Amino acid sequence: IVGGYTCGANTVPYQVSLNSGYHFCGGSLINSQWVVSAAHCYKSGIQVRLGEDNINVVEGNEQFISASKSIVHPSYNSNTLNNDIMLIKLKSAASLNSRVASISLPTSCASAGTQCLISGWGNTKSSGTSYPDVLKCLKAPILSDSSCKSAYPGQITSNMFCAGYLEGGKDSCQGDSGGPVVCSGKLQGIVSWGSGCAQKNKPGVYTKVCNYVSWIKQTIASN
Ligand SMILES: NCCCCc1ccccc1
Ligand SMILES: [Ca+2]
């Protein structure tokens, strides 16, 4: 996250870190046994780390649970990043509390102008690299469809939305992928892609979770 603030330990209780020996992607806890993330984050051998603030220090609220199954969206396209979403089932159910909590799925798509919270442990520099060890937070509005398609001609599908600031300086960045965009207590987006980070007229692009709610429900009802 570039140009954000430190969230504070366990103030984003649905935020997970996907670890394969190191943090590589964020994700979101949607019930005690399932996590949603970006399909471009797919890996074999994922351990899900819940209750994290400092990912390099064991602080006392963590739950490390291995993944038993990963399901990438049936129409994920890695070239266009259309349908960049996947589900991860945990080997055992997480123990839910005020610091490890699931986030609700949406019943409605959020509108342009809605302010949202984006969070992750990704790069905090638009030029150069510095990875935080504690969770970073950013409040950003959903941008209109037409400003989004104007920023990325011929690349925005109906399963994508832009969110952020057209004059740059504030954005999600690498390592934030798979992470949550939460608007009014509902998961609305997944950190998916962009052109660099925090660049002028190149806002973050997010997977539109409201389009996927019935595939999510049906898939967790069956696996
Ligand atoms: N601008 C969008 C921010 C999304 C993440 C990102 C990180 C590194 C390279 C491209 C996009
Ligand atoms: Ca920790």
Which domain CATH number covers 89? 2.40.10.10
Which amino acid would we find at residue 220? I
Q: Which of 40, 53, 119, 192 is catalytic?
A: 40
Atom of ligand 1 nearest to the CA of 177: 5
Question: How is residue 50 written in tokens?
Answer: 């819940």
Are residue 98 and residue 28 in the same domain, yes or no?
yes
Are residue 7 and residue 91 in the same domain, yes or no?
no
Domain limits for position 4? 1-12+103-210
Alpha carbons 36 and 184: distance in angstroms, whole number: 18
Are residue 87 and residue 34 in the same domain, yes or no?
yes
The Cβ of residue 28 has, within 10 Å, a number of other Cβ atoms equal to 25
Experimental technique, in short, is X-ray
* Closest residue to atom 6 of ligand 1, CA basis: 173
3-state DSSP call for residue 40?
A: helix
Resolution, expressed in angstroms to one decimal = 1.9
Q: In what order do the strands lie in the sheet with 160-163?
A: 5-6, 136-141, 115-120, 180-183, 186-193, 204-208, 160-163
How many domains does the chain contain in total?
A: 2
Are residue 165 and residue 113 in the same domain, yes or no?
yes
Binding pocket residue ranges, ligand 1, CB within 6 Å = 171-174, 176, 193-197, 202, 204
Atom of ligand 1 nearest to the CA of 174: 7
End-to-end alpha carbon distance in the chain? 33
Are residue 42 and residue 129 in the same domain, yes or no?
no
Are residue 95 and residue 194 in the same domain, yes or no?
no
Q: What are phi and psi for residue 13, nearest 5 degrees?
A: -75, -15
Phi-psi region of 222 (alpha: psi -120 to 50; beta: other; left: phi over 0): alpha
